Structure formats: structure tokens, C-alpha cells
Design a protein around this ligand. Structure first.
Ligand SMILES: [Mg+2]
Ligand SMILES: [Mg+2]
Ligand SMILES: [Mg+2]
Ligand SMILES: [Mg+2]
Ligand SMILES: [Mg+2]
Ligand SMILES: [Mg+2]
Ligand SMILES: [Mg+2]
Ligand SMILES: [Mg+2]
Ligand SMILES: [Mg+2]
Ligand SMILES: [Mg+2]
Ligand SMILES: [Mg+2]
Ligand SMILES: [Mg+2]
Lengths: 163, 141, 176, 94, 38
RNA sequence: AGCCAGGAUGUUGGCUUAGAAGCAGCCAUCAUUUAAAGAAAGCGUAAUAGCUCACUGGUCGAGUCGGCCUGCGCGGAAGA
């Protein structure tokens, strides 16, 4: 390895992945298999790539003393074991879901997804981001307005009104 | 994917499928029928071409036969039909025997589109690079 | 040092009766238990037991740490109690228990009937498992040893009385 | 950095000399220049350290005598015939 | 066990203990490494 | 130091190879997957092996490692 120098290094880089970062996910990894790497790196073949890293650096004293890149509320985000997930290029969307549906398949605990940076706070996995470049959800979102929400109430009596 | 349950790989060439002398009672003895190893194989083997070595998983439960999901061949045998000698190493690094270049082996690395641990279409280049240097082959990149 | 310098925390329930150099602990279960010490000085106070050396003794610490651990296992002793478990292997084995004396069949020309000691009882949930709880860690460990002894595990097929924490190497016989 | 403190020898000869290395010291000398040569005793384990650093034989060295800084170069060193210790050291007023 | 006058640990699972006045090697993997008189 | 994890993919590498898919064998030891993972440690295989090691993360929380110069002891050590 090395000393204080190797230390700072991993941080400034790992933490520039939080400064220049598109997104951030904190996932405790008890019982982490190599299949684990074989996943976020498989979901990197034909859907991601090297635009993502996830260095288990719960070195804390490291990854944390080294977020003077402005990462408050992360002392609370420093408990137990974690595997920092940081985005550089691409949207912040897809990356979150990957773990969301990984850990839910068992694939090691997800630290109840303690949440992370970008919005900046605590725990509560949302779905803002992943619904993007699927704007056909805004095609289906208009709900035909005048027509679909029509053929559902203005036209739902007959199929349920002759009682 | 899971882990372990049943799978091996012991063949010579697709040119002569389901051989007897080379493997025989060794091609499978756990749930694999020696005669049933010429039906699901050639169903896709004779479907593209025969010649190159083709190993494969041997997913075996307890339902009579077996199910093998095949993929890619050894990128090392691609030096007997698409490079030079009928052999390979023989005389490794005591003399500059064979020599390939950057040009060749390109579309050889291109075929394995579902068999490469490197999303970087460029990184998965130096991987087969060694697969053509395990016998004493210099590279004229 | 270390193990010695550690606490002990007398769980709300244990009597902790320090009479000079004699400590007696009773609680929940377990017929009390009361051992002795020597170069170690023990101190009660608060909700714990502290263990330290004693000037003039080079045994110190070393005698003190074993004090800790011992005393430690004495608390827990009467608290949770103590584990066990052995399984018999090989056709025609099997154990019994029928009181406080276990009857063993191990392929001799005779049963064995081993008689449990004081503060330790055991049951045979199965023909081939002996599980023996007790307070005195030092004693279960024995009766286990003592039992397993009638027929330690041969290293060829594995027949004999194992623990469960077993490892049984087992090897092939000389070639022909 | 090579700074070594010593004391002017009150005795000399194999007698006192063997009493030095006995009490974890050792004899030294300092000659050169128009200044008359000097009887010096150094601490073993101290200097034993400075001599392992290959820098000890190339860079000038500084000697403190009752507090008077001499500074010389490591002319010659006598080692033990079979142990890792110093026997005696010559020093030149350079 | 071996009663050599030099004991030496051999494997990595070989221990080296003094029980009574006697140095011994205790190997957990291989019993051929068991030794006394050291 | 324990204890919790992990230890792949090109690559079953080709090879004097009956069969060799890391370890009686030859020579090679290069490049990826990433926090680490050696064509390389061990048991030992009909051949797969199954299960475990260097090396990295976690827990814990103050020391820990091996040489050097020296003092005193242990084994080595059986006889009428
Ligand atoms: Mg670290
Ligand atoms: Mg005179
Ligand atoms: Mg004399
Ligand atoms: Mg004895
Ligand atoms: Mg540690
Ligand atoms: Mg482990
Ligand atoms: Mg093989
Ligand atoms: Mg080989
Ligand atoms: Mg082998
Ligand atoms: Mg790293
Ligand atoms: Mg280690
Ligand atoms: Mg001596």
C-alpha cells in the first residue's frame, strides 16, 4: 500500500467522484460475493461501463475526512460498513435501480439504502431519475386527458350502471 | 446464474462430434448419456460449421438427460486454422517461431460479443493478445 | 494484560459473593460455583468485577487474566448455561440416558453406562446425539471428552463419537 | 548531520583501551593539520549507528570535544575480527 | 512422533509449545510433524 | 491478532501432452473484471473437483513486527 499519501489519494479521487459526481449510492455489503462485481460490471457491458465505480472505502477516516469537497449530513452517512457508489458521466438514473433490484434479490444487504448525495440527506429510496428517457411515460401520462380519463369514468357507467 | 451443480468440458474438435476413442465413457458419467451427446450438440453445431473446439456447461438435475448452454470457443486453437502451424507451442521462447500482428485477431476478438469481461471494446483487445503469445508469437502491432 | 484489563459486568441477577480470596457466583440456574485465585486481586464495586495483578508477583496479569476469563465464564455459567453436543457415527452405535447415567453402545462386547457428575445433565434427542448442558464449563468440556473417549473417531471411515466441531481427516488405505 | 560527541582520553594503551570497549565505549584518534593529534573516546552503540549509513564515509563528520566542535573525515576504522562492533577509528582534521 | 534433538516447525500449521520442561511442535494439519525432546 | 466477507474472467493456455481444464509434466507468468483474486498455496481427483490460502474490505481500538548488542537459564543427556 502506502501511508498518509496513498490515503489522501484514494479520497480526493473517490471524493471528486462525489464533487464532479452525477449520483451517489451507499450500500453496506455483508457477505459481498465476487458475483457482486460480476453484476454492476455486467450491467456495465451493454447498459453502462467504466462511467461508474464502487470502491469499498468505508475507510471512513479516509472517504470522510476527505469530503471537504462538501458532503455534510454524511457523518450520519458513515455508519457501519458501506460500499460507496459514485457516478461520473451519464444520467444519475439507472445506477440507483441496479442496486435497488440487486440487494432486493438478496445480493447482500443494501444498508436499507441510507441514501446519499446530489439532493443531500438521509434514507428513502425514490424513483426520480430512472423514469427519464422513457418519456412515453409522459405519453401515457397525458392519459389522453380528454379521452382516456374519459373512457374510464364518463364511459364506465354503462359497464357498471345498469344495476 | 447460481454457482455449482453440474458442468465440465472435455473435447477435441467439432469436426468429429461425439467421439468414442478420444473421450468415450469419459465424455460424461454423472447424468449424461454417451449416445445422447450427438443430438442437442449437432442441433446447432452442424448449424454453423464444424472444426473448432466447443466446450460447454452441463446443467444436470435428475430429469433424465442434460442441458448444455454453449457459447464461445478457445481463442488459442484459432492459430491452427487462422494463423499458422498445426501445432502451437512446441518450441516456445527459444526462437521467434510464429508472428501475428495488430491487424489479424481483430475479428477474432470481435466474434466474442457475449464473452468478454471488458465493456471497453478496446480493452478486450489485449486479452486475446496473450492468447496468441502462449507459444512464442511476436506481435507486429 | 488485556483480557485481564477488561471488565466483567455482573449481570443483574448473580449474587457475586467475594469473601477474601473466594468468589461465589449464583443466579438463574447453576448450583452456585465458587473458585479461588492467588496473585490476582479482584475488586467488585459498581456493576462489574475488576481484575488486576499485585506487587511482588511476576505471575501477575497472567494469573489475573485467567481470573477474568474464569470468573467471566462463571457469570455466564449460571446465566445462559453451557453448551455441548456429540454425535455417534457408524452402524450399531447409539446412546441412551435413563436418569443421570448415559448408556452407550459402541461395538464392544458390553454396554458402557457412563454416569454424569454433579451439576451437569444430558439428553439423547436422537439415538445418536448426546447433548449435555451444565454450568461448569470446565466440567461439561470434561464429560464430553470423557464420553467421546470410549470410542474416538477412527481416521478411515469416521466411526466413533465426534463432537460436531469435529474435523475428521479420514484417508485412503495403502495402495493394494 | 553526522555529529558525534566524545571526551578527551585520560588514559591510553591496550589496558585502558580494553576497558573502553568493555564499558560500551571505544577509542579514537584525531590527526592532521598543524594541530597536534588527539586522544578521543566515543560511545559504541551511538556511532555504531552512524557507520551503517554509507553516508558516514563520504560526507564530513563533526566532533564535539568538551564542547569545541572539530569536524573531520573518517580516515580508518578497525572492526571486530568476528563481531559487529567497532575496534578503533582514525579521524583526519579535514 | 519424532524425537529429534532439533524440532523445527515444518508446515504453517505447526505450533511449538513447551509442556512441562519439554519443547514440542504441535501441527494441526499433519501429525507427522508432532515432536518432542527439543 | 482474531472474528465477518470475498478470491473471478480472456483462460479448459498451448504444450514431449494415451486423457491435463492452476499444482509428477514442458515453457510461458502476459492483459482484463474491480476494493482485492495468483494460469497461482493446500487436501486430493476417472477428469470436472468440493472445500480452504497470499492479497483487499468490515468489525474491534492500542499497540504491533523482526533482526542487532549484551546477562542468566531449557532440551540435546543411556550402565551395570
Ligand atoms: Mg485502508
Ligand atoms: Mg607510557
Ligand atoms: Mg594487559
Ligand atoms: Mg505428562
Ligand atoms: Mg486485522
Ligand atoms: Mg477467509
Ligand atoms: Mg487437468
Ligand atoms: Mg499445464
Ligand atoms: Mg491437477
Ligand atoms: Mg484498490
Ligand atoms: Mg492477512
Ligand atoms: Mg547461556
Amino acid at each position: 500500500m502506502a501511508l498518509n499519501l496513498q490515503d489522501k489519494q484514494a479520497i480526493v479521487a473517490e471524493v471528486s467522484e462525489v464533487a464532479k459526481g452525477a449520483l451517489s449510492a451507499v450500500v453496506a455489503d455483508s457477505r459481498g460475493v465476487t458475483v457482486d462485481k460480476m453484476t454492476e460490471l455486467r450491467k456495465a457491458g451493454r447498459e453502462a461501463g467504466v462511467y461508474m465505480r464502487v470502491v469499498r472505502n468505508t475507510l471512513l477516516r479516509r472517504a470522510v475526512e476527505g469530503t471537504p469537497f462538501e458532503c455534510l449530513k454524511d457523518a450520519f452517512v458513515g455508519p457501519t460498513l458501506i460500499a460507496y457508489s459514485m457516478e461520473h458521466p451519464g444520467a444519475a438514473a439507472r445506477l440507483f435501480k441496479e442496486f435497488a433490484k440487486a440487494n432486493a434479490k438478496f445480493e447482500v444487504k443494501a444498508a436499507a439504502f441510507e441514501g446519499e448525495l446530489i439532493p443531500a440527506s438521509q434514507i428513502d429510496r425514490l424513483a426520480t431519475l430512472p423514469t427519464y428517457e422513457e418519456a412515453i411515460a409522459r405519453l401515457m401520462a397525458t392519459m389522453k386527458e380528454a379521452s382516456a380519463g374519459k373512457l374510464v369514468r364518463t364511459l364506465a357507467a354503462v359497464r357498471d350502471a345498469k344495476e | 446464474a447460481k454457482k455449482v451443480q453440474a458442468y465440465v468440458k472435455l473435447q477435441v474438435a467439432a469436426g468429429m462430434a461425439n467421439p468414442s476413442p478420444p473421450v468415450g465413457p469419459a465424455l460424461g458419467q454423472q447424468g449424461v448419456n454417451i449416445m445422447e451427446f450427438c443430438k442437442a450438440f449437432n442441433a446447432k453445431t452442424d448449424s454453423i460449421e464444424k472444426g473448432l473446439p466447443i466446450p460447454v456447461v452441463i446443467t444436470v438435475y435428475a430429469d433424465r438427460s442434460f442441458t448444455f448452454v454453449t457459447k464461445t470457443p478457445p481463442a488459442a486453437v484459432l492459430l491452427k486454422k487462422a494463423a499458422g502451424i498445426k501445432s502451437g507451442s512446441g518450441k516456445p521462447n527459444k526462437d521467434k517461431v510464429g508472428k501475428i500482428s495488430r491487424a489479424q485477431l481483430q475479428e477474432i476478438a470481435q466474434t466474442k460479443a457475449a464473452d468478454m469481461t471488458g465493456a471497453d471494446i478496446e480493452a478486450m483487445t489485449r486479452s486475446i493478445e496473450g492468447t496468441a503469445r502462449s507459444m512464442g508469437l511476436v506481435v507486429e502491432d | 494484560s488485556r483480557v485481564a484489563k477488561a471488565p466483567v459486568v455482573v449481570p443483574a441477577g448473580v449474587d457475586v459473593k467475594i469473601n477474601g480470596q473466594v468468589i461465589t457466583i449464583k443466579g438463574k440456574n447453576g448450583e452456585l460455583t465458587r473458585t479461588l485465585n492467588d496473585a490476582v486481586e479482584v475488586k467488585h464495586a459498581d456493576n462489574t468485577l475488576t481484575f488486576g495483578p499485585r506487587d511482588g508477583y511476576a505471575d501477575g496479569w497472567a494469573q489475573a487474566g485467567t481470573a477474568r476469563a474464569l470468573l467471566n465464564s462463571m457469570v455466564i455459567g449460571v446465566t445462559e448455561g453451557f453448551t455441548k453436543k456429540l454425535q455417534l457415527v457408524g452402524v450399531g452405535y447409539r446412546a441412551a440416558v435413563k436418569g443421570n447415567v448415559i448408556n452407550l453402545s459402541l461395538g464392544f462386547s458390553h454396554p458402557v453406562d457412563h454416569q454424569l457428575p454433579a451439576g451437569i445433565t444430558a439428553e439423547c434427542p436422537t439415538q445418536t446425539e448426546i447433548v449435555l448442558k451444565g454450568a461448569d464449563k470446565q466440567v461439561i468440556g470434561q464429560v464430553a471428552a470423557d464420553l467421546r473417549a470410549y470410542r474416538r473417531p477412527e481416521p478411515y471411515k469416521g466411526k466413533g463419537v465426534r463432537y460436531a466441531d469435529e474435523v475428521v481427516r479420514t484417508k485412503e488405505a495403502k495402495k493394494k | 548531520m553526522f555529529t558525534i560527541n566524545a571526551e578527551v582520553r585520560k588514559e591510553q594503551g591496550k589496558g585502558a583501551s580494553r576497558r573502553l570497549r568493555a564499558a560500551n565505549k571505544f577509542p579514537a584518534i584525531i590527526y592532521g593539520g598543524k594541530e597536534a593529534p588527539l586522544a578521543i573516546e566515543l560511545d559504541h552503540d551511538k556511532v555504531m549507528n552512524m557507520q551503517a549509513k554509507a553516508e558516514f564515509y563520504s560526507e564530513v563528520l563533526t566532533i564535539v570535544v568538551d564542547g569545541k566542535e572539530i569536524k573531520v573525515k573518517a580516515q580508518d576504522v578497525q572492526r571486530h575480527p568476528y563481531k559487529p562492533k567497532l575496534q578503533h577509528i582514525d579521524f583526519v582534521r579535514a | 512422533m519424532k524425537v529429534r534433538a532439533s524440532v523445527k516447525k515444518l508446515c504453517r500449521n505447526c505450533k511449538i509449545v513447551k509442556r512441562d520442561g519439554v519443547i514440542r511442535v504441535i501441527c494441526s494439519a499433519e501429525p507427522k510433524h508432532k515432536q518432542r525432546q527439543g
